[PDB]
Design a protein around this ligand. Structure first.
Ligand SMILES: O=P(O)(O)OC(CO)CO
Ligand SMILES: O=P(O)(O)OC(CO)CO
Lengths: 246, 246
């Protein structure tokens, strides 16, 4: 499996900081045929970032609409995306499930619209702190994954991301072992419902807090194929997180 | 009052159709100091559209976030908008209230974030078909307006838009008279809660279906100061709607 390292800038950035940040990123020398590195800027920053990042870096948007072109003020459709040649899109990030009540149904439809338009998808899912304490982690994960996994046709174009919400912002910590356990169960769910060749091909990223110090012990895990970095991706030291996967 | 004519492209467009459409728009000769004409493209199309449209045309985005910079995947903040020099933003469009459950609280917060960052706002509100039949039109509007009207400081930078939802997609038609009545009640709500100089200064646009044939009889109304055009703005004949307000 080809490692995958994504930078989710979320809602941050100014024309200037981005110029500076990309300038750092460009310096890192790596083979894009051996590693996937994707940068997800704010929609209105897409063109700007794309012109500054060299071809070795892929780019994409943080969200895609579940509807197609039409009367949907404020949305961006997979079609619009395809036309601009955006390559990846993030789907189901917990922040959207939390503040915008995006449901598993939305996730499914968005994924469908994306695949139909030849977009690659970074699909997110994970259990809450409350669900983890109730030992429902696997039950929850299974449900969420089984909500869209059947729509996956090409397992090189859909990247799954496990976002242990429970650890993110609660004073908790997901250890390389804990994550490796779930990453194994997810991969098993794919195997049982899509076949082995597929399960061994699909990539499952860790989406909890990742930084220059813990990235190595994470990428080392068997079923962890890279990550979806958050705040760390806003620093120049992000290049080291990439190096950890070279 | 300086007339206002806005083009809400919603979720439509391709790099090519936009080049063609703007080419048409550019041809129309008008004085921007006498008339406000604003185009709202898809976020990912903003730069492209802005480079093609001549200075006489203002541009803005279809939606703005209620949060500031930070962990809000998929959102665009007023701060980021300001940095890019985006001038206007649409807030509360019924399509967002309908499909994304944006509430009057979201509208207030979004408006606040916008004003704090020196952005001009196009605020939308309107009653449903069901509420109109129950003769609750004035009641509903008053509520929605009284949800943010106090935050208005500079009455040249906030444009109110009445979107008679009822007439949009039900087989109903809002006559120039019907709209003119509501526009009068809205302006009175501003007068009683913000004063006369303000009420007489703020622009109140009509948001129902507008086309080359009914625009004139609408702009003629006393309390109608322009419009927020939808599908008609996707045609080259949109220039005639502009002319109707010159
Ligand atoms: O938790 P942080 O520091 O915001 O960053 C993330 C995710 O959201 C790490 O992959
Ligand atoms: O109803 P249409 O044709 O989509 O256009 C609109 C609004 O949404 C007219 O201002």
């Amino acid at each position: 499996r080809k490692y995958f390292v994504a930078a989710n800038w979320k809602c941050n950035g100014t024309l200037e900081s981005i110029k500076s940040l990309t300038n750092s990123f460009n310096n890192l020398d790596f083979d894009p045929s051996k590693l996937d590195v994707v940068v997800f800027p704010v929609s209105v920053h897409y063109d700007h970032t794309r012109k500054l990042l060299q071809s070795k870096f892929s780019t994409g948007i943080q969200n895609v609409s579940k509807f197609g072109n039409g009367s949907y003020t404020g949305e961006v459709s997979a079609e619009i995306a395809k036309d601009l040649n955006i390559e990846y899109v993030i789907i189901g990030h917990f922040e959207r499930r939390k503040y915008f009540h995006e449901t598993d149904e939305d996730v499914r439809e968005k994924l469908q619209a994306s695949l139909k338009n030849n977009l690659k998808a970074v699909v997110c899912f994970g259990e809450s702190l409350e669900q983890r304490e109730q030992n429902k982690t696997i039950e929850v994960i299974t449900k969420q994954v089984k909500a869209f996994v059947d729509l996956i046709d090409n397992f090189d174009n859909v990247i799954l991301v496990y976002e242990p919400l429970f650890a993110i912002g609660t004073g908790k910590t997901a250890t390389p072992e804990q994550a490796q356990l779930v990453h194994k169960e997810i991969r098993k769910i794919v195997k049982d419902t899509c076949g082995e060749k597929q399960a061994n091909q699909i990539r499952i990223l860790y989406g909890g807090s990742v930084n220059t110090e813990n990235c190595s012990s994470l990428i080392q895990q068997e079923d962890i194929d890279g990550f979806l970095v958050g705040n760390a991706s806003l620093k120049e030291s992000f290049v080291d997180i990439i190096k950890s996967a070279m």
